[PDB]
Ligand code: HEM
């Protein structure tokens with residue numbers, strides 16, 4: 102009843118060009134079995150959305166990577182938010198929601214926007230830049246560590262640590278095992294910065310620690326919730342902003358529409374998140390035998406969700422393979438869906454909006470002028486290098 106496929110969604114061949122294989126996965130059926138890793142897969146929007154929105158049946162506390170925490174030891178202490186189910190999930194989630202809330206966004210927006218405008222002005226003086234290192238990486242590095250309240254020393258560990266986290270959700274392939282082999286210095290740095298005395302007043306980290314007396318979290322939970330933001334909040338935005346720049350370089354008609362109405366900046370970024378889905382995949386584990394899209398899945402089984410595929414499923418989207426900055430993107434799953442839906446989405450959108458606004462107001466053309474290089478990661482999609490020439494407006 103369930104078709105078996107040999108596609109390896111964690112192979113470099115897949116990362117290099119996932120879209121044909123994702124159509125094969127969607128068209129094979131609502132539920133597939135991936136013999137390569139002995140997991141179920143769902144690649145259509147309908148089933149991905151259904152799985153995300155039934156956390157009781159498709160739980161996260163046994164890991165959202167391939168590894169089943171009931172069978173293997175986690176490579177690090179489990180996340181108190183990502184790798185927790187209700188009810189344990191609920192109060193830590195509420196704390197991070199209030200830390201990364203609308204009020205916090207109002208406090209940081211002006212500085213995030215000034216930093217984006219200044220970066221674009223700087224890049225325009227250079228003309229020919231690498232939109233990854235010099236923009237997608239440089240801009241979040243110029244705002245997010247400071248907003249966290251991190252000291253200056255040691256920030257070179259942040260991107261390696263995040264790459265490690267997202268590789269570690271994958272299977273035990275060379276990407277994962279190499280990342281884990283080199284991880285000790287990055288974990289040591291990150292875990293240390295999660296302690297209250299190392300987080301500057303008023304930053305996201307100090308705000309988490311300041312929530313440890315309401316009855317929602319205890320002081321011993323705060324370091325791991327800081328760890329969540331340092332795991333999830335930098336590399337994702339790098340790939341999201343890089344995706345948006347890549348899209349504007351490949352779809353010049355859409356750059357021209359954005360220039361003509363810079364208030365499209367926020368939707369242009371959201372559409373980039375749908376179109377390139379920086380977080381491509383992750384898992385749930387079934388807590389019982391369940392029927393999904395006509396197929397029966399046993400208890401204790403890993404289910405791989407293809408978020409990027411769901412965001413390109415023609416059963417849900419018109420012209421899914423077009424980048425359209427006026428698309429109604431509501432319902433895309435690039436930030437997830439349901440109780441775990443990205444708690445940092447307002448930070449992500451703020452960064453992407455103010456960067457695309459700066460581009461819309463200051464740049465007339467973005468032309469690829471060098472070899473484009475992909476960055477390979479078990480669960481993130483993004484570029485390693487994006488050489489562009491920026492023409493000033
Ligand atoms: C374009 C940027 C981003 C993308 C594409 C993204 C994507 C996602 C997705 C798909 C999930 C759901 C995971 C699941 O259901 O298992 C998620 C959760 C989460 N994200 Fe993001 N994210 C982004 C930015 C951020 C930022 C900026 C932060 C923090 C400042 C952050 C922190 C978190 C946390 C803590 C969770 C766990 C939430 C929970 O389990 O309740 N993310 N993200």
Ligand SMILES: [Cl-]
Nearest residue numbers: 177288291292
């Ligand atoms: Cl760690």
